[PDB]
Amino acid sequence: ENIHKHRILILDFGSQYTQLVARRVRELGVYCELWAWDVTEAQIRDFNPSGIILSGGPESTTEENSPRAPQYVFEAGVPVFGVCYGMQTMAMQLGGHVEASNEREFGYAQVEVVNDSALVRGIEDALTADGKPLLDVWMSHGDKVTAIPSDFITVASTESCPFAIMANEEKRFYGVQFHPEVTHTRQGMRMLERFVRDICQCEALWTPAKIIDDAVARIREQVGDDKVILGLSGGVDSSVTAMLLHRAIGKNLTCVFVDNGLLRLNEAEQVLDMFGDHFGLNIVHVPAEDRFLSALAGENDPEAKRKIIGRVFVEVFDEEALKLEDVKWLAQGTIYPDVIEMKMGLVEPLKELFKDEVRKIGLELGLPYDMLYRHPFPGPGLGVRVLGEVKKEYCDLLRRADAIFIEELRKADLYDKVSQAFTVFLPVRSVGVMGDGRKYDWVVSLRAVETIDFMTAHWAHLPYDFLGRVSNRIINEVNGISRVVYDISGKPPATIEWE
Amino acid sequence: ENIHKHRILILDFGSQYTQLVARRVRELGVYCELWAWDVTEAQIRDFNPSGIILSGGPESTTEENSPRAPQYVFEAGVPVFGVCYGMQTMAMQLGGHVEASNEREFGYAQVEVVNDSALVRGIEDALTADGKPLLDVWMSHGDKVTAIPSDFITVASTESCPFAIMANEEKRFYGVQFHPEVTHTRQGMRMLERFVRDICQCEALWTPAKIIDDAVARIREQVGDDKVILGLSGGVDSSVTAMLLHRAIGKNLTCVFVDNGLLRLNEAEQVLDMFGDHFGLNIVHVPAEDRFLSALAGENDPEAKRKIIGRVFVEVFDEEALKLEDVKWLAQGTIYPDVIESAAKMGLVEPLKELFKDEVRKIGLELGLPYDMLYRHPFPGPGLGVRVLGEVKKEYCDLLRRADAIFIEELRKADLYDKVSQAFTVFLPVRSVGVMGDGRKYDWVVSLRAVETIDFMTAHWAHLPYDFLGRVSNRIINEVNGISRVVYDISGKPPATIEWE
Amino acid sequence: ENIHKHRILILDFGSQYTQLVARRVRELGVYCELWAWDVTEAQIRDFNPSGIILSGGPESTTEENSPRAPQYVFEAGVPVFGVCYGMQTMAMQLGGHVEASNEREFGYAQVEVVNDSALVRGIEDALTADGKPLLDVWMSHGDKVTAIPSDFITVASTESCPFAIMANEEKRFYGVQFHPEVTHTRQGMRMLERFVRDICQCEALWTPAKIIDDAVARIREQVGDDKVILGLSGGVDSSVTAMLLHRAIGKNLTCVFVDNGLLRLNEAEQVLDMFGDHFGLNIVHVPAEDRFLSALAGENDPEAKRKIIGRVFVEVFDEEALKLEDVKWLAQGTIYPDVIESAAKMGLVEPLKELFKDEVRKIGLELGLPYDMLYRHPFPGPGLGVRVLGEVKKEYCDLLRRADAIFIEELRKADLYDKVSQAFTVFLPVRSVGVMGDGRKYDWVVSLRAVETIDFMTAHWAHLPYDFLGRVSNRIINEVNGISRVVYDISGKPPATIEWE
Amino acid sequence: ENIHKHRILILDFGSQYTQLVARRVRELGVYCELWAWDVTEAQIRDFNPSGIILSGGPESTTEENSPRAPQYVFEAGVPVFGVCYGMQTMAMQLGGHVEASNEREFGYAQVEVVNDSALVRGIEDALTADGKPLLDVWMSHGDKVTAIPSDFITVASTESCPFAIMANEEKRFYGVQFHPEVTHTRQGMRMLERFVRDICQCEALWTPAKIIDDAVARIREQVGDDKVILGLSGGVDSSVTAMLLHRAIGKNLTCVFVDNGLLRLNEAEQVLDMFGDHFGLNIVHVPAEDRFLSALAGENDPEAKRKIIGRVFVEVFDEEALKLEDVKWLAQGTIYPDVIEMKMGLVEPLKELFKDEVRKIGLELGLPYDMLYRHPFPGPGLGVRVLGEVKKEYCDLLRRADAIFIEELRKADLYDKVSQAFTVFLPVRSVGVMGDGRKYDWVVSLRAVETIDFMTAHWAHLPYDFLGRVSNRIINEVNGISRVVYDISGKPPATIEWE
């Protein structure tokens, strides 16, 4: 009945969708872990998985140096699901044949189900002209599975792929050549569920409410009646951590909030108000705007500024951490993605969770929706949003302008449309407004992206009229700003942030 | 395990969203019934609700004979949740005072939580300047509630609405002046869940899987070993009914499928093949195209065409029912909304009578049906009989099937199919200079029709992308021999109707 | 000054732009005529041109007995300007060479000027670092000119075309492989002007004002004091003819306006009131709606309908004519293109026989006619008779006549009228359901047709804005009792036509 | 022949359209001058106008000290034509009644001709249902004319404006409440032609060819055989001035071209090659890049930079003037709008001309179309386009980056779609090309506006496709640039240029 009882082991062969697969299983209410393919029978059997999923991977199975699944995987006695590369490698290691091809395929297709299988019985999206089941899927196949292991049957086929789905109903081995984890596969979720809950027989115990109970229980057994310290950044991870700890150990939790004077408009106030006033947490608020600024004085180098900011934060925190008596633990908002890729113990209650799961438990814990589902803010904050040397004047101008930008983005039902959106301050002067009495004022640049790939972002084609409303506002109401420009650079060639 | 044990009762005061409240509760996994507000205590006691919800309504509690909830509602000893008007009448009937108002608020607002309540505890959408809780809601208040009953407390307020949420935690009576059932209320579902699951303590047993098992058990007990007949139209309700009846009684089910020559391209083949060959259902196939067409020969009045098609259908179905022996029951795909509306030799088996259409589709999926068939835009009863203007002729019917097929194929490829409530083609018996190739001096015309239905009285013509429109237009004229021109319906509802006949 | 004195002769080799060449010369204020390439030295000598232009053409000089310019063209002693094929025939006839090739070219290019010429001197769109003038031109060449006559020089060149402009300055022979008559050649009008005004030494005497004075003179000379009759149709040619004659002979002119009941909203009265009340012309108004509709009753075929309307008009007009005494002349609004095309009891007066349509419009304005009437998109001769598909009934005419007025009013009200080539409404003889407020169920349908002409063979259905369309259909259905629905034609040309029938 | 014999006097009451009115009169082939309304009778008399036009103006005849046409205007014996406020003050001053209104009308309307007038006889755009004459006009109704002088007749009316056109055929006074100079008024031009040519009896002698002859004759009369010096900039006005002077005095003209180092890519070469070789002009080339940069070094204030550049140019030019023997005249390309807005005499051949007229005569004199119709280039060049300190290094990077921008615009057929288009150099750095490129390069901004009024310019909504294409070119091609941004600031609140 422990929520980790039934679990899925997912072996990563390098696909870009592997974390997506793991996240989907979590969404279905089943715990799972994601490991690299190069493991041992020892590890695997130590884990004791209810079922194993082999992901996709860019490499070719026809290669001599190409990755394979540990033979124990197929000997463990639990269902296995191969996705693309996982399906190819499954064929290889079991008797099938595969040969390479220069041109690869990746896109929507409709496959026809020609045989009954536990995995897809009753799951059909469309019908052929003669009433045969078709599944709309998101294909992905490089190598050519020319033959499958003798034990298997052909479950589904399509023009560009005769073995679109293969299965061994007795051994419970299934392989597909499309991605069920991508929404393009219309009934993909339903296929993953079929395997995880029906075939592997896992109950849906991994739900936000149960995750919270388990976390609280664990924090209690680890920390007992000891005191814990935690740095509150105002961000998502540390905020949810603060709530979990507050729930588990109450008055033994002390939080430290360092105000470096590099945060957004009203950010410091809202953080202390919500946490200290509304929730009643004990917060040590350090007003260090001066300490950070004086340490940044005359520094134009971005590498340098970041280092300075990071160093001074540790000095301030360590100082405070030393003023507290009987503190035996440091709490941290570490999340699973981080794990995947004085002398105080370390408490990390979010360690097994994906960002999306953290938002869900955050809500259940009573945190505001808007704070949890907002765009990320860098660690150095406005320290890198201000090009060159950082002065208070600039930061004050910047947060006012960025506030207006964000206000209008949410108001224009556009905030959820962009992956990230910020304002950069340009240390240059141009002809200004007739009210400020300033001939020349400072300049700012808006930056909205659409991170298509983890390494490839697109510059947001924000509506012209929208941009014009924004531009007018920032120049009119934010005294000290003459004009506004918009970043029309993608990644590549440019980077998302300027520094 | 009785999936109907925990149940919610929803009294309708006339709100446009009442059925929507009922569907959210079914989505949450709890059985519920929707009734008119004018009921008796005896009826409520019979139902024995685990909780009660008083919907919104266009009326005013200040009016002399305005609707009111039966008083037993507040004496049943179960939780009560009043939405908008249901909140206003709860105030009035328990000691509060409402004030009449002509100007009414209906739109997005942020209310500030100022007191604790089991209803909204832990639910926050944003923060005020001092970090106090805010909820993003879809407000709706006509008259001005000026005083809540003495035993209640203000849970949340707003500028124009002093008492946005009121509660009597001891009695478990809550009233909100906004609609949690609409998506504009960011955490509305969570609030409905708080009420149905936590406060009313209802288990969530009303799921697609258990609903099927329940339906089957009921079918087996009511029909036993009798033979049952069903008219298979290929539509959603009859298709799901067929699958449920099949699972329950197997071989004792006989489906009668009548091909009236007014269905779409390959529709009759797909139905016959999927049902008979794929699923193994016992189907009596009646090829009746000629019989329907002859009957429609020379009829121009659409009012008459409708009457004819319906008339010939009953004849045919009856003729077939008479050829079968020992058939004691007639199965029908009647759904809950048909019953609610009707509330406003052979016995009858109605397996879907308690379900809303979205639930029917969910169970259809579980039963193995194709997604595209279940989520297909509605198709009129007399089919293409009302899609072909005036006299229906086989020639016109086959041309229309061809053009319609292209129009739908393209909509799907373009990810536009689900962007419209309905989309079809109408055949116009008018001449347009023929296409060089077809060899005719003149060919026919078809009109594309696509709308976004706002409500059952308002629908807007879809602003489909010009390139898409030119692509379809081109394909139809070039591919369907016999059609030389394509037009697009730019008439909305009102003043025009969705269908042309 | 005789405005016909200095004139240009244009030989037509079959280009779609030949009339455009002629129109541009007219715009430069010089009289010109367009003849077939197959003429004699004798005919050319009688005309005595100050210059000669050889137009483009789809044929090939390499083919046996292909078109050639009369050799007198190159011996006349006047400048000659050959355009595309005309330049190729120039090269072939004077000692150059052309290689056949089916790989044609029709598009934008920049030619580089490598030598001085009276034709391009001081005319350039840009310069090259090299120091050479550049001309942005609309190229067009199929066959490949491999050699120019030994006495010619290469004036300009481009990658794909080494001899883009050739010339013999002494003889004043010039040839280009681009069309300067199309606006795509930025400096084209400028080149044509250098040739016409500077090289051929032709002063600009052919202007609207002077054309009017010349026409009036010629009319008074021909008709003298006789009486003239003219049928007023409401169109451009007869209207300008009317005003011209009114100015020439005043009271001696009698106009006959036959009211066939097939005109637009308020048209017949505007004609009568403007020409009668405002300009004071003698107008015999002949009511003939009933005569036309009776003769149109039961007629469905478009070709038949066209024949009927034309027949009845001749009948009505001739009857009214015999009723008149002393009339010895019938005035007609024949324009130059009618004559050009034709090239393949009482006298006839035709004051517009030398003018192109755009010249007729310019003189109309000078004569005081309304701009909108003159620059109006084309209206068919049989009018509504063909816009009302099927049998022409008065009820239908009056319905179309109203729906169209609104469509047009809205186009103009939205400054969209000038953005389309043609725009009109078609009456569909099919009914539709819907009019809620009226309580009326089945009414007629109309189709809106708006296109953008790209070429004589190709036209695009206009991408008119959605809200403009919604506005129009809304007004139409609501303001025209009898119309329940409005559709919009989304058929391009090809595969479809502009007019329906 | 005297092409100045017949001329129209135009009195400006402050409308943005007044200059457009003068231009229309020149287009019709008649000479005219634009003056401010506040002149005396002696001045008007000295001008001896053939006709007088009274323009619009934002004011209202109702305010006490409101602009009034000088009384003589109505007593000169020549026709008078009032437009909008010009009509209003005409009504007022001659006896009609007008009355203030808070709101003002500006849009399309149709006015019905109710009476015959020399101004509108034979001019009609549409017909009423009764076949009565209508004119489609661009209505601009400010105050309300509630009455007209006793000797005037209503010529046209509209519901919302009873006195759309008023006339006194006897005295030849006409007033309209719409703008004939705008194309929205269908036959507006024919109305102006009717006034200027028929009613005023003015011949159309003000033509490009006749103006050229008149100019050459005046230059010769003013200069004789004296030598003339002219600064050749490569811009439209100096180029047309040089060609005029070349035609008038040949070899006696020496053009001095100063390369200040703040010019565009290959501009210097282009000017010399074109005017020197192609047109055969005597050019004195002055390479002064180092003299300008040294004087610009260190300086960062734009007001200071423009001043330095102007100073050093006079220094360089004067030095050369002194080196030349027998130079008695300095020729300048001053044009009419400028006027409306060892020592030697001035020769200003283009002083009476508007910019569009200068262009038509330029084409006549053989200059290329694209150079005559190119967007304006600031006298300070890249000096005010390289923000802050100007370094050759920055100007060099900018030319390449701007060359690509204009190259792309011309191709996409967008160049003639905007009034101005340039690139600005921002002295701020950003992260550069990944892997093999530079880590920290500079940033540049694109700027493209569509001028709506002299003090009003909208930022061009350039296509997203185009903007992306350009950003890419500049970044990867221009070595030293890493980010391209687009100025989204209209005017107001911002200016067109940055310095």
Ligand SMILES: Nc1ncnc2c1ncn2[C@@H]1O[C@H](COP(=O)(O)O)[C@@H](O)[C@H]1O
């Ligand atoms: N302003 C701050 N005050 C206190 N702790 C902070 C602050 N900023 C960052 N931290 C801590 O640094 C951790 C990492 O932040 P991030 O850089 O967003 O991953 C947060 O989870 C906090 O525990």
Ligand SMILES: Nc1ncnc2c1ncn2[C@@H]1O[C@H](COP(=O)(O)O)[C@@H](O)[C@H]1O
């Ligand atoms: N309704 C009519 N009444 C009088 N004359 C007409 C009428 N329709 C056509 N005509 C005459 O026939 C000529 C042919 O014009 P259309 O057929 O419109 O090109 C017109 O210019 C008139 O001279």
Ligand SMILES: [Mg+2]
């Ligand atoms: Mg005609």
Ligand SMILES: [Mg+2]
């Ligand atoms: Mg200048």
